[PDB]
């Protein structure tokens, strides 16, 4: 849900710039224990309402793993690298499930974000970071409440000695 990002340091906002046409994204997440989760998503704006349509194919989750045992715990926060490739945006990130007990199961996200504007119409962001925190606020197998906060930034914490972002 990439419309909701606080960008700092003047980084252009590929997603907000995409309206009113909208954008799509596509991703495969590779889990360290063999699972794969692939998704395609369409984001549109219907009046005042953002509308998401998502298609999902997940496979190869081990029967004995945290995912299929529905003992996955909670996600840690994470940081995505986001950069232009050909004329769209690529993202990659590592995420980690903190299983009940305190141990972690990691995965790797591979994403392409596609504006429905021509990139001639867009101000493309340079390489940057998108921090996220996703929290399952309530397990109300059937009804969940989920929160996310996201920030798009450069590496402020370790500054350049050479003028670089």
């Amino acid at each position: 849900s990439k419309t909701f990002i606080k960008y700092v340091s003047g980084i252009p906002d590929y997603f907000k710039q995409s309206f009113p046409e909208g954008f799509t994204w596509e991703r495969t997440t590779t889990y360290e224990d063999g699972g794969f989760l692939t998704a395609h998503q369409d984001t549109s704006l219907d009046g005042d309402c953002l509308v998401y349509k998502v298609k999902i194919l997940g496979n190869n989750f081990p029967a004995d793993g945290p995912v299929m045992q529905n003992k996955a715990g909670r996600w840690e926060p994470g940081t995505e690298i986001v950069y232009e490739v050909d004329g769209v945006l690529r993202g990659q990130s590592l995420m980690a499930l903190k299983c009940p007990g305190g141990r972690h199961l990691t995965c790797h996200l591979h994403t392409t974000y596609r504006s429905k504007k021509p990139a001639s119409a867009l101000k493309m962001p340079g390489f940057h970071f998108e921090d996220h925190r996703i929290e399952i606020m309530e397990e109300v197998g059937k009804c969940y409440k989920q929160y996310e906060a996201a920030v798009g930034r450069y590496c402020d914490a370790a500054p350049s000695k050479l003028g670089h972002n």
Binding site: T3, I5, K142
Partner: protein, 59 residues
Amino acid sequence: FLKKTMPFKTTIEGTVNGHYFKCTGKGEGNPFEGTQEMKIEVIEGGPLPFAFHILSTSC
């Protein structure tokens, strides 16, 4: 066209390890502040036999 607070809605359809499911969701957030929250309901294939967590980055 965007606003400081915006609603959103979702439909999700999928298969995971041969198990079909469908969800709908509704939420709201502050796009420029980067915060959002939603409720996701499994309308087909519930209760999910897999951890919802693998859907978190999609919903």
